[PDB]
Design a protein around this ligand. Structure first.
Ligand code: PRO
Ligand SMILES: [Mg+2]
Ligand SMILES: [Mg+2]
Ligand SMILES: [Mg+2]
Ligand SMILES: [Mg+2]
Ligand SMILES: [Mg+2]
Ligand SMILES: [Mg+2]
Ligand SMILES: [Mg+2]
Ligand SMILES: [Mg+2]
Ligand SMILES: [Mg+2]
Ligand SMILES: [Mg+2]
Ligand SMILES: [Mg+2]
Ligand SMILES: [Mg+2]
Ligand SMILES: [Mg+2]
Ligand SMILES: [Mg+2]
Ligand SMILES: [Mg+2]
Ligand SMILES: [Mg+2]
Ligand SMILES: [Mg+2]
Ligand SMILES: [Mg+2]
Ligand SMILES: [Mg+2]
Ligand SMILES: [Mg+2]
Ligand SMILES: [Mg+2]
Ligand SMILES: [Mg+2]
Ligand SMILES: [Mg+2]
Ligand SMILES: [Mg+2]
Ligand SMILES: [Mg+2]
Ligand SMILES: [Mg+2]
Ligand SMILES: [Mg+2]
Ligand SMILES: [Mg+2]
Ligand SMILES: [Mg+2]
Ligand SMILES: [Mg+2]
Ligand SMILES: [Mg+2]
Ligand SMILES: [Mg+2]
Ligand SMILES: [Mg+2]
Ligand SMILES: [Mg+2]
Ligand SMILES: [Mg+2]
Ligand SMILES: [Mg+2]
Ligand SMILES: [Mg+2]
Ligand SMILES: [Mg+2]
Ligand SMILES: [Mg+2]
Ligand SMILES: [Mg+2]
Ligand SMILES: [Mg+2]
Ligand SMILES: [Mg+2]
Ligand SMILES: [Mg+2]
Ligand SMILES: [Mg+2]
Ligand SMILES: [Mg+2]
Ligand SMILES: [Mg+2]
Ligand SMILES: [Mg+2]
Ligand SMILES: [Mg+2]
Ligand SMILES: [Mg+2]
Ligand SMILES: [Mg+2]
Ligand SMILES: [Mg+2]
Ligand SMILES: [Mg+2]
Ligand SMILES: [Mg+2]
Ligand SMILES: [Mg+2]
Ligand SMILES: [Mg+2]
Ligand SMILES: [Mg+2]
Ligand SMILES: [Mg+2]
Ligand SMILES: [Mg+2]
Ligand SMILES: [Mg+2]
Ligand SMILES: [Mg+2]
Ligand SMILES: [Mg+2]
Ligand SMILES: [Mg+2]
Ligand SMILES: [Mg+2]
Ligand SMILES: [Mg+2]
Ligand SMILES: [Mg+2]
Ligand SMILES: [Mg+2]
Ligand SMILES: [Mg+2]
Ligand SMILES: [Mg+2]
Ligand SMILES: [Mg+2]
Ligand SMILES: [Mg+2]
Ligand SMILES: [Mg+2]
Ligand SMILES: [Mg+2]
Ligand SMILES: [Mg+2]
Ligand SMILES: [Mg+2]
Ligand SMILES: [Mg+2]
Ligand SMILES: [Mg+2]
Ligand SMILES: [Mg+2]
Ligand SMILES: [Mg+2]
Ligand SMILES: [Mg+2]
Ligand SMILES: [Mg+2]
Ligand SMILES: [Mg+2]
Ligand SMILES: [Mg+2]
Ligand SMILES: [Mg+2]
Ligand SMILES: [Mg+2]
Ligand SMILES: [Mg+2]
Ligand SMILES: [Mg+2]
Ligand SMILES: [Mg+2]
Ligand SMILES: [Mg+2]
Ligand SMILES: [Mg+2]
Ligand SMILES: [Mg+2]
Ligand SMILES: [Mg+2]
Ligand SMILES: [Mg+2]
Lengths: 197, 136, 191, 193, 172
RNA sequence: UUUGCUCCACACAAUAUAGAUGGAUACGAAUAAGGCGUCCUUGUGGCGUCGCUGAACCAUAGCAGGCUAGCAACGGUGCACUUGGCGGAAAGGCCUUGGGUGCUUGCUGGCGAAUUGCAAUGUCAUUUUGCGUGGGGAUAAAUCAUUUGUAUACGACUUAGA
RNA sequence: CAGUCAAGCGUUCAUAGCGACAUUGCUUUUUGAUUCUUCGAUGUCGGCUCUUCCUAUCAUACCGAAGCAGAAUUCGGUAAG
RNA sequence: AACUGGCGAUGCGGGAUGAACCGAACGUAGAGUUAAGGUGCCGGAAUACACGCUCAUCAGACACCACAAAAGGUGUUAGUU
RNA sequence: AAUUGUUGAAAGGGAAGGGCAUUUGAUCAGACAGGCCAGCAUCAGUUUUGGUGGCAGGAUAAAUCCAUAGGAAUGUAGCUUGCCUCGGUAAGUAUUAUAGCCUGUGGG
């Protein structure tokens, strides 16, 4: 549809986002995921802490470096849920992956672009009301992720500049729907009204 | 300082709650909830709209904030006599829902040439409004 | 079996206006003002008349309905805690060593200092919670009293002291030393 | 942490200059000669950078360098490195820094008597070293053949790779070490018979 | 086992010289098609009489259409089933609109709550409960209280494209 | 060492390309709740309204979009210039002043289009490099050898040398 | 090596600590049974060395229990840092 | 040991993997329909429909098959007297 | 021939090589002078996916609908009662009234 699709991770269940991101990727659709730290996982935080530790223990015996690499940042956890849904050792897989970017926070460009949502992975729509779940930021920070405060600092300042942005915006669209009302009942407008508009 | 508690004002599964079907041979038509079977099943009838008396998952319908007087379990004719009476149809026809439906039904009847007339039309509105949006 | 609806009543008094936007609660009356968050729970409140508020669970499981009542409680305590107040009393108990208790401050702090517990040359400290006021009872021996509006802030500042005085390495039935909550009540008398 | 600018003295000793080169004696020594021009004009382009730091920068470090000529060494090519600055206010830290360009700073404004300091240096190096001295492995018995300053069992049979935790002959020394908790027993002065 | 129809079935012990006009027994089988229905008929007759298909004959197989299919009813249901540790009778109450639509959810309930598949249930009796308050079971009695109403909270909308530009409501 | 390097300009050439072909169209937060408008005592506020999908919004007519006349407006948009200001998370992009200029399908005209023969993507993206032209700007170093020994099996390290 | 029932031991008191007759398991450093792999060859005890892992924890950390007064011990939990 | 079917001597599809299981037995190809088995993504194929059940601080997840038992639970579920 | 040097082209993120298929590069035969390819129309064989017409069964579908008789309550109107801000409640009567429903029989 679009050259690049920006996804506001906040509120999205890891595997169900990874699943749809994988498929957009492989069907040629470049995708960028933001605010990965606000990503969700089914089950309370302990189960998912325990889970990451189970991961954490696997390493090559004779040389812990060649073995599995464990990445702490909410985005790299997210890329990891993704990469295993992609035939990533093939030519085609490296292809599809390069179309994907994952970030903590909403960094430049993408803070001014519009970012979009995935209903089929939206927790508030998916999970049963009353289940317990996990925020990827808390889960990352508990296993070594360093930059949780810096990010929320940088974001708490982002969401300011954007409220202003939105503010001016909502103020202007008040004029536009104002002018749009002088134009109503005219000849033009009532005609369009007939044609559905 | 009185107390001041929210609301959360739901549409309710009740007798005489009008309900807009969504999928099936009746899909798109309105209907009333006669009697109420359980937490999911309901018995609807809509003799105004040509929808037959039936049981139907509330899944397949969407409740509408319209509601009229109906005896529980009222048979089809009595349904038709109250529906009328209550003046349901114009009440729903008046609404921002049901208009925004017609709205999109129309935009999809459009003739290629009709579409083209819509373009110039909007060119015409746009000129004069983009103007006004610069004078106050 | 999913009970379709159930509800609990929250009586409201004459000195108090509780206010619930989303599921944030703020009871406010004479003794101060208390606010507690219930977003974790999923009930529907409903003002009915400056003396009454209702809370509701639609189509709930046994576990869900259960937490209904206990939502009503937590808001009654917030009410009663802001009209009357909460008073928790604990008395020291020792066998040979007078447990000696004080209120020490380091950096605007307010702690509860406990020395010579069972002799221990170690000095025990429990920080005074905010919203709670500790008084050493006059006219009664080895009584300490914690007061305030947050039942849950008193009762904990209560048990923090008691449990800072657990007995290690000795038969804990012959060695009944410690400080124990002896009596929980309200701040306004008569009631 | 990312560095976003680096403002420099107007004048640079042939000491710190000597560090930026590998064949000084041949070089035309033109390093910083265009940077130093930034002062010629009123300042502006250095004020703006110094100003940047202040508006941004959660950390400020000072570039200092040793006066190696004031030392008996033969080695002229002075050492330079970054010292974080720990007094108040970001804007104050740069003001302090701005203020010191080309001016000097000595040990007493840093350390005092009886202070506990850590040393950071690169251990004396010893080249290639058998496992006996480099890890302290037991000497094998005299009767043993094809040598004895070894580990005898390099590994189990499985996993069937000598492993990263076995001790093995290699370089010893020239390692970076951060030692802590050395007391200063004296902060001596040069001007002081 | 499928979507159910009710069938009356009728058979009789193949006639003999000295016993022409044998006696005729009917059942009401709850099955999906007429071929299963007769199978069941013989399954159960050989549980009461000396017959088998080999020696009898079906006299009439007739579908029975629910009498008032837009009259909500409260159905009592009587069952015998085999568990992994023995066999036991039961009674449940199903609120629906035709004897057959109830037999459907019965076999579902029996399957979900008691892991019992078709092969292990026997439908002893299904009966329209006339007066209320003979409705014994609670999960039904809930729905018979006067002027009953109830919301449907946290409503969740079937998104028809992969991406969305809003951020949903669950409002209702 | 054969007049080399670099930023801006155009020209020819080559070589690409995980896949342009109207527009990635910016609050935040909640979801057993919110968006928007409006009123006030500015609140966990009164009142109104909406959702039930972007099926939207914006754009979109003109030789792939040629040549020209005019009217109504004083609005729109493209460009190159300039005014003031913002943005360091990867800012490298955003907002604003003022003239000059192109276009305007807001409306009314004059002229052209065929023969590409009934379809054959019927070519209009953006990569990187190379060669000459002249509009700005800039005049190093690293290595070998020699050398120290704070280093070293050898490479490597560390010094020193107009 | 660990359970279940609990008749009994434990002054009294089944289960603090134990536990008959029975019965249910687990483990694969016992030993058997088997003969699938290797007889144009997998060098075959013990120690030395040295690494790593398991836990059915001997010590060390913090605990619950006691037929724990104190000191000592014992049963048990989190535990192989 | 018995009967049959197989593997051996046999590829193809399913069972990730695999002599023997499921399906189906092979000349070279095209179009179609399927079996066994599947259809979040890897991966062709409904993040399909409908009723329930389950929340596990070592959940669970498809025959052969890659194991668990007695005994318990005021977790919750529906039933019986 | 194995194996080797040079030169030329090309590929190379823990081997190489192979199968089916196609891109691109290089190279080549034949065939025009009816050769290679296509596009539409009408048809043929196989096939897949839609719109639509006429009929047969059944309790000659079962319902709704209509008429009729009976009935009850998750009891509509009225009445009574009791508080209760001039009626609204609540608990009583009370089966159709100022709503309706159930059950049988009959009709199309
Ligand atoms: O090993 C051992 C056997 C015993 C006999 C000879 N080799
Ligand atoms: Mg692509
Ligand atoms: Mg590995
Ligand atoms: Mg992976
Ligand atoms: Mg790809
Ligand atoms: Mg949901
Ligand atoms: Mg609201
Ligand atoms: Mg349309
Ligand atoms: Mg103890
Ligand atoms: Mg002791
Ligand atoms: Mg810079
Ligand atoms: Mg040199
Ligand atoms: Mg010397
Ligand atoms: Mg050395
Ligand atoms: Mg040596
Ligand atoms: Mg050794
Ligand atoms: Mg020897
Ligand atoms: Mg090693
Ligand atoms: Mg059968
Ligand atoms: Mg039988
Ligand atoms: Mg049976
Ligand atoms: Mg769907
Ligand atoms: Mg490519
Ligand atoms: Mg924004
Ligand atoms: Mg706002
Ligand atoms: Mg609102
Ligand atoms: Mg507002
Ligand atoms: Mg005012
Ligand atoms: Mg306001
Ligand atoms: Mg408001
Ligand atoms: Mg829009
Ligand atoms: Mg034009
Ligand atoms: Mg024209
Ligand atoms: Mg004019
Ligand atoms: Mg103009
Ligand atoms: Mg930056
Ligand atoms: Mg970036
Ligand atoms: Mg920048
Ligand atoms: Mg202009
Ligand atoms: Mg135009
Ligand atoms: Mg072209
Ligand atoms: Mg030039
Ligand atoms: Mg010179
Ligand atoms: Mg035993
Ligand atoms: Mg016994
Ligand atoms: Mg005892
Ligand atoms: Mg006892
Ligand atoms: Mg005894
Ligand atoms: Mg016992
Ligand atoms: Mg075993
Ligand atoms: Mg074994
Ligand atoms: Mg052993
Ligand atoms: Mg053998
Ligand atoms: Mg052997
Ligand atoms: Mg061999
Ligand atoms: Mg050998
Ligand atoms: Mg061997
Ligand atoms: Mg060997
Ligand atoms: Mg040998
Ligand atoms: Mg005793
Ligand atoms: Mg003792
Ligand atoms: Mg002792
Ligand atoms: Mg314990
Ligand atoms: Mg260890
Ligand atoms: Mg370990
Ligand atoms: Mg066989
Ligand atoms: Mg055979
Ligand atoms: Mg053989
Ligand atoms: Mg064979
Ligand atoms: Mg075979
Ligand atoms: Mg296969
Ligand atoms: Mg199979
Ligand atoms: Mg995969
Ligand atoms: Mg697929
Ligand atoms: Mg586990
Ligand atoms: Mg366990
Ligand atoms: Mg384990
Ligand atoms: Mg799990
Ligand atoms: Mg089985
Ligand atoms: Mg398997
Ligand atoms: Mg047993
Ligand atoms: Mg059991
Ligand atoms: Mg149970
Ligand atoms: Mg039973
Ligand atoms: Mg490699
Ligand atoms: Mg010819
Ligand atoms: Mg030919
Ligand atoms: Mg052709
Ligand atoms: Mg044909
Ligand atoms: Mg037909
Ligand atoms: Mg008919
Ligand atoms: Mg009658
Ligand atoms: Mg009514």
């Amino acid at each position: 549809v679009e050259p690049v699709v920006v996804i506001d991770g906040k509120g999205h269940l890891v595997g169900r986002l990874a699943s749809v991101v994988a498929k957009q990727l492989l069907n040629g659709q470049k995708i960028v995921v933001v605010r990965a730290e606000e990503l969700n996982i089914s089950g309370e935080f302990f189960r998912n802490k325990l889970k990451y530790h189970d991961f954490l223990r696997k390493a090559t015996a004779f040389n812990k470096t060649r073995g599995p690499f464990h990445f702490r940042a909410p985005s790299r956890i997210f890329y990891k849920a993704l990469r295993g849904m992609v035939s990533h050792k093939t030519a085609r897989g490296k292809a599809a992956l390069e179309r994907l970017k994952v970030f903590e926070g909403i960094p430049p460009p993408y803070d001014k672009k519009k970012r979009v949502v995935v209903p089929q992975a939206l927790r508030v729509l998916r999970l049963k009301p009353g289940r317990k779940y996990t925020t990827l930021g808390k889960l990352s920070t508990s296993v070594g992720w360093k930059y949780e405060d810096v990010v929320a600092k940088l974001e708490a300042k982002r969401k300011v500049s954007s409220a202003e942005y939105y503010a001016k915006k909502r103020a202007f669209t008040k004029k536009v729907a104002s002018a749009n009302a002088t134009a109503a009942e005219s000849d033009v407008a009532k005609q369009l009204a007939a044609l559905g508009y | 300082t009185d107390s001041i508690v929210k609301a959360s004002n739901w549409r309710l599964v009740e007798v005489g709650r009008v309900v807009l079907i969504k999928k099936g041979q009746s899909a798109g038509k309105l209907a009333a909830i006669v009697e109420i079977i359980d937490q999911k099943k309901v018995l609807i009838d809509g003799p105004k709209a040509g929808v037959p008396r039936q049981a139907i998952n509330l899944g397949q319908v969407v409740l509408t904030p319209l509601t009229f007087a109906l005896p529980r379990g009222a048979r089809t004719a009595t349904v038709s006599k109250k529906w009328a009476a209550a003046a349901v149809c114009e009440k729903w026809a008046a609404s921002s829902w049901a208009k925004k439906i017609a709205q999109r039904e129309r935009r999809a009847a459009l003739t290629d040439f009709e579409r083209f007339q819509v373009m110039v039309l909007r060119k015409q509105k746009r000129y004069t409004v983009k103007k006004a949006l610069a004078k106050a | 079996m999913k009970y379709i609806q159930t509800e609990q009543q929250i009586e409201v008094p004459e000195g108090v206006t509780v206010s619930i936007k989303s599921r944030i609660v703020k009871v406010v009356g004479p003794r101060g003002t208390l606010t507690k968050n219930l977003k974790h729970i999923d009930v529907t409140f409903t003002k009915v008349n400056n003396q009454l508020i209702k809370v509701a669970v639609h189509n709930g499981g046994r576990k869900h309905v259960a937490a209904l009542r206990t939502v009503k409680s937590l808001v009654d305590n917030m009410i009663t805690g802001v009209t009357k107040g909460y008073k928790y009393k604990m008395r020291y108990v020792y066998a040979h060593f007078p447990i000696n208790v004080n209120i020490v401050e380091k950096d605007g702090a307010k702690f509860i200092e406990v020395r010579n517990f069972l002799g221990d040359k170690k000095i025990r400290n429990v920080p005074v919670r905010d919203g709670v006021t500790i008084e050493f009872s006059t006219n009664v021996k080895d009584e300490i009293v914690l007061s305030g509006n947050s039942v849950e802030d008193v009762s904990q500042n209560a048990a923090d002291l008691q449990q800072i005085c657990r007995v290690r390495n000795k038969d804990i039935r012959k060695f009944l030393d410690g400080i124990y909550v002896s009596h929980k009540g309200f701040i306004t008398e008569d009631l | 942490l990312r560095s976003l600018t680096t403002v420099w003295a107007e004048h640079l000793s042939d000491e710190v200059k000597r560090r930026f080169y590998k064949n000084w004696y041949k070089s035309k020594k033109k390093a910083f000669t265009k940077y130093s021009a930034k002062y010629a004009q009123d300042g502006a382009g250095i004020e703006r950078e110094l100003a940047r730091i202040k508006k941004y920068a959660s950390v400020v470090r000072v570039l200092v360098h040793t006066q190696i000529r004031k030392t008996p060494l033969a080695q002229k090519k002075a050492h330079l490195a970054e010292i974080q600055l720990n007094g108040g206010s970001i804007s104050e830290k740069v003001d302090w820094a701005r203020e010191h360009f080309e001016k000097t700073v000595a040990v007493d404004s840093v350390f005092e008597q009886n202070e506990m300091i850590d040393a950071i240096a690169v251990t004396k190096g010893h080249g290639f070293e058998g496992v006996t001295h480099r890890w302290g492995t037991k000497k094998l018995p005299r009767k043993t053949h094809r040598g004895l300053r070894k580990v005898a069992c390099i590994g189990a049979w499985h996993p069937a790779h000598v492993m990263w935790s076995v001790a093995r002959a290699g370089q010893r020394g020239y390692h970076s070490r951060t030692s802590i908790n050395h007391k200063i027993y004296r902060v001596g002065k040069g001007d002081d018979e | 086992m499928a979507h159910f129809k009710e069938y009356q079935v009728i058979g009789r012990r193949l006639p003999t010289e000295s016993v022409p006009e044998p006696k005729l027994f009917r059942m009401r089988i709850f099955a999906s098609n007429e071929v299963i229905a007769k199978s069941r008929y013989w399954y159960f007759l050989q549980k009461l009489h000396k017959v088998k298909k080999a020696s009898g004959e079906i006299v009439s197989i007739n579908q029975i259409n629910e009498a008032h299919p837009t009259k909500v009813k409260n159905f009592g249901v009587w069952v015998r089933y085999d568990s992994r540790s023995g066999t036991h009778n039961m009674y449940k109450e199903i609120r629906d609109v035709s004897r057959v639509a109830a037999v459907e959810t019965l076999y579902q309930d029996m399957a979900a709550r008691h892991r019992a598949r078709f092969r292990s249930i026997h439908i002893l009796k299904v009966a329209e409960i006339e007066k209320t308050a003979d409705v014994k079971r609670q999960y039904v009695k809930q729905f018979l209280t006067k002027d009953l109403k109830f919301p449907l909270p946290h409503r969740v909308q079937k998104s028809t494209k992969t991406f969305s530009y809003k951020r949903p409501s669950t409002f209702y």
